[PDB]
Amino acid sequence: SEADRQLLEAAKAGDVETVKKLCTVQSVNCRDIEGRQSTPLHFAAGYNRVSVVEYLLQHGADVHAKDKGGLVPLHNACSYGHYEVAELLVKHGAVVNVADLWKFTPLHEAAAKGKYEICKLLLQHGADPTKKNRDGNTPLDLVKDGDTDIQDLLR
């Protein structure tokens, strides 16, 4: 519907005032049907819209909602290096060892994308560096050659 479509666009743009205007109990966890079924929190998280992320969480956004590929907003935060966002989600109860349809964890995302401090954050909250995805790869397996500091951290 149009209202949900606009909410999603606002959460993506970081347009707080429009979020405040369209976020109802009915719509706060709506899903983008045309894409990979992201929720407003997925978008706010993936696009590093901290205020929107805070607002949505405070107004009942589901920190554990999986999209079409089985991603939770923490995946989005971790893959794109949004540290504060990652911290917000974790502090609000996000499961760190959560796994998508391919058994990728946020730690797989953060490791493959070369985000050290995010990897560290995940490890401090008990992320398992030994978890394998569908390809039989640990997050360590996914680390670029240059990122020896991340290899060391995961090891």
């Binding site: 894409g35 997925h42 993936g46 696009y47 995946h75 989005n76 290096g81 949004h82």
Partner: peptide, 12 residues
């Protein structure tokens, strides 16, 4: 096949 999360690394 597996595609990227909604989002991007850089706000600019």
């Amino acid at each position: 096949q597996r595609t990227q999360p909604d989002g991007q690394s850089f706000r600019s």
